[PDB]
Design an enzyme around this catalytic site. Structure first.
Site, PDB file in Angstrom:
ATOM      1  N   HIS A   1       0.881  -1.225   0.000  1.00  0.00           N
ATOM      2  CA  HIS A   1       0.000   0.000   0.000  1.00  0.00           C
ATOM      3  C   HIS A   1       0.868   1.207   0.000  1.00  0.00           C
ATOM      4  O   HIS A   1       0.510   2.185  -0.709  1.00  0.00           O
ATOM      5  CB  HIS A   1      -0.900  -0.021   1.248  1.00  0.00           C
TER       6      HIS A   1
ATOM      7  N   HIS B   1       5.404   6.761   6.976  1.00  0.00           N
ATOM      8  CA  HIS B   1       5.100   6.414   5.601  1.00  0.00           C
ATOM      9  C   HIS B   1       4.533   7.652   4.920  1.00  0.00           C
ATOM     10  O   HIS B   1       4.279   8.646   5.558  1.00  0.00           O
ATOM     11  CB  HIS B   1       4.102   5.253   5.510  1.00  0.00           C
TER      12      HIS B   1
ATOM     13  N   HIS C   1       1.737   9.082   1.591  1.00  0.00           N
ATOM     14  CA  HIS C   1       0.698   8.921   0.595  1.00  0.00           C
ATOM     15  C   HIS C   1       1.000   9.882  -0.535  1.00  0.00           C
ATOM     16  O   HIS C   1       1.435  11.014  -0.258  1.00  0.00           O
ATOM     17  CB  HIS C   1      -0.697   9.231   1.163  1.00  0.00           C
TER      18      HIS C   1
ATOM     19  N   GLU D   1      -3.743  13.389   1.748  1.00  0.00           N
ATOM     20  CA  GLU D   1      -4.993  12.914   2.342  1.00  0.00           C
ATOM     21  C   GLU D   1      -5.740  14.102   2.945  1.00  0.00           C
ATOM     22  O   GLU D   1      -6.900  14.388   2.545  1.00  0.00           O
ATOM     23  CB  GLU D   1      -4.670  11.814   3.387  1.00  0.00           C
TER      24      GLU D   1
ATOM     25  N   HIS E   1       3.241  10.784   7.136  1.00  0.00           N
ATOM     26  CA  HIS E   1       2.619  10.448   8.423  1.00  0.00           C
ATOM     27  C   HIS E   1       3.642   9.810   9.317  1.00  0.00           C
ATOM     28  O   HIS E   1       4.146   8.726   9.016  1.00  0.00           O
ATOM     29  CB  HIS E   1       1.464   9.474   8.188  1.00  0.00           C
TER      30      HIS E   1
ATOM     31  N   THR F   1      -6.270   6.212   8.352  1.00  0.00           N
ATOM     32  CA  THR F   1      -6.783   6.495   7.021  1.00  0.00           C
ATOM     33  C   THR F   1      -6.764   5.285   6.112  1.00  0.00           C
ATOM     34  O   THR F   1      -7.153   5.402   4.926  1.00  0.00           O
ATOM     35  CB  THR F   1      -6.065   7.656   6.358  1.00  0.00           C
ATOM     36  N   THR F   2      -6.309   4.124   6.612  1.00  0.00           N
ATOM     37  CA  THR F   2      -6.424   2.841   5.896  1.00  0.00           C
ATOM     38  C   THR F   2      -7.143   1.887   6.809  1.00  0.00           C
ATOM     39  O   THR F   2      -7.160   2.056   8.016  1.00  0.00           O
ATOM     40  CB  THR F   2      -5.069   2.210   5.489  1.00  0.00           C
TER      41      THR F   2
HETATM   42  N1  LIG Z   1      -2.356   6.580   7.360  1.00  0.00           N
HETATM   43  S1  LIG Z   1      -2.340   6.526   8.960  1.00  0.00           S
HETATM   44  O1  LIG Z   1      -1.235   7.243   9.463  1.00  0.00           O
HETATM   45  O2  LIG Z   1      -3.664   6.863   9.484  1.00  0.00           O
HETATM   46  C1  LIG Z   1      -2.105   4.840   9.433  1.00  0.00           C
HETATM   47  C2  LIG Z   1      -1.225   4.511  10.446  1.00  0.00           C
HETATM   48  C3  LIG Z   1      -0.979   3.182  10.819  1.00  0.00           C
HETATM   49  C4  LIG Z   1      -1.697   2.192  10.153  1.00  0.00           C
HETATM   50  C5  LIG Z   1      -1.471   0.794  10.572  1.00  0.00           C
HETATM   51  O3  LIG Z   1      -0.711   0.525  11.506  1.00  0.00           O
HETATM   52  C6  LIG Z   1      -2.477  -0.178  10.025  1.00  0.00           C
HETATM   53  N2  LIG Z   1      -2.187  -1.494  10.625  1.00  0.00           N
HETATM   54  C7  LIG Z   1      -1.282  -2.437  10.324  1.00  0.00           C
HETATM   55  N3  LIG Z   1      -1.378  -3.508  11.177  1.00  0.00           N
HETATM   56  C8  LIG Z   1      -2.279  -3.130  12.116  1.00  0.00           C
HETATM   57  C9  LIG Z   1      -2.693  -3.822  13.278  1.00  0.00           C
HETATM   58  C10 LIG Z   1      -3.637  -3.185  14.061  1.00  0.00           C
HETATM   59  C11 LIG Z   1      -4.156  -1.955  13.690  1.00  0.00           C
HETATM   60  C12 LIG Z   1      -3.684  -1.297  12.562  1.00  0.00           C
HETATM   61  C13 LIG Z   1      -2.757  -1.898  11.803  1.00  0.00           C
HETATM   62  C14 LIG Z   1      -2.649   2.526   9.189  1.00  0.00           C
HETATM   63  C15 LIG Z   1      -2.875   3.836   8.830  1.00  0.00           C
HETATM   64 ZN   LIG Z   2      -0.910   7.467   6.453  1.00  0.00          ZN
END
Ligand SMILES: NS(=O)(=O)c1ccc(C(=O)Cn2cnc3ccccc32)cc1
Ligand SMILES: [Zn+2]
Length: 260
Positions: free
Chosen positions: A64, A94, A96, A106, A119, A198-199
């Site tokens: 992703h 990471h 986007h 985003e 992020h 956001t995912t």
């Molecule tokens: N874009 S953002 O900064 O909002 C963002 C930050 C972190 C994640 C994950 O850790 C997703 N993920 C990956 N493994 C996980 C286990 C439990 C919960 C979430 C988990 C997804 C989105």
């Molecule tokens: Zn993010």
């Protein structure tokens, strides 16, 4: 169900709610930041970003995006202050980004889309680890930083140069000694609001802190992001582009500003 979702016609953001019904919840992210209606809050404190002891370990193409991971087993790279109670430890960052310079972020600012968004993800130490933190409404603090295309960001180049080694989903590489201070703009002025990942799984566990000042990256640096692939080795090429969720309804929330 955190496979089968992605960033396309048939599995992208508009479909996520079928596997993850919180997609239509009350505190989803990202949002449009309407700068005129965001309230200056004089009770907000300066953000404290303490990254001097950060220990990156590895970079990963998770299919992703790519994640730069940190050893979060000690009290090292911490976010505090700002709107936060307590201390939050850096676990990963990471980005986007878009297929074109005119989209990719985003969050939006008065509907403006930036070319990308960084992020920096932190978890609240009162919950002991990330997996327990995400189950709490104050479990995470994500520091979001916009990217515009212009001058190169020198502190980004070590990331860009490793990407060819993790072109495809599931590739990782030692990525030690990366200093995330080199990704920060000069000002720490910010907006803040309660939101979500956001995912998928889209959990409503995040205090968002979005810096007003973007960083500049070069066309060449973002072009290298866009050579990554969403597929695994030996599969048909799908360029890793447009890995952003659009703005979601603000619903019953107030965005606060640390400035002006
Ligand atoms: N874009 S953002 O900064 O909002 C963002 C930050 C972190 C994640 C994950 O850790 C997703 N993920 C990956 N493994 C996980 C286990 C439990 C919960 C979430 C988990 C997804 C989105
Ligand atoms: Zn993010």
């Amino acid at each position: 169900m955190s496979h089968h979702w992605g960033y396309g016609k048939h599995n992208g953001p508009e479909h996520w709610h079928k596997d993850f019904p919180i997609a239509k919840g009350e505190r989803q992210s990202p949002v449009d930041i309407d700068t005129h209606t965001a309230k200056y809050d004089p009770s907000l404190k300066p953000l404290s970003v303490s990254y001097d002891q950060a220990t990156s370990l590895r970079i990963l193409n998770n299919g992703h995006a790519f994640n730069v991971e940190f050893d979060d087993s000690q009290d090292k790279a911490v976010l505090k202050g700002g709107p936060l109670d307590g201390t939050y430890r850096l676990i990963q960052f990471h980005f986007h980004w878009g297929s074109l310079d005119g989209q990719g972020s985003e969050h939006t600012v008065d509907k403006k889309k930036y070319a990308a968004e960084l992020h920096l993800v932190h978890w609240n130490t009162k919950y002991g680890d990330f997996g327990k933190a995400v189950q709490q409404p104050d479990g995470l603090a994500v520091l979001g930083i916009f990217l515009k295309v212009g001058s190169a960001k020198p502190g980004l180049q070590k990331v860009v140069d490793v990407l060819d080694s993790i072109k495809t989903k599931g590739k990782s590489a030692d990525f030690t000694n990366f200093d995330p201070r080199g990704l920060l703009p000069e000002s720490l002025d910010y907006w803040t609001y309660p939101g979500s990942l956001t995912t998928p799984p889209l959990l409503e566990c995040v205090t968002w802190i979005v810096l007003k000042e973007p960083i500049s990256v070069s066309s060449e640096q973002v072009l290298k992001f866009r050579k990554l692939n969403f597929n695994g080795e030996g599969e048909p090429e799908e360029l890793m582009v447009d890995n952003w969720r659009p703005a979601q309804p603000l619903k019953n929330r107030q965005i606060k500003a640390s400035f002006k």
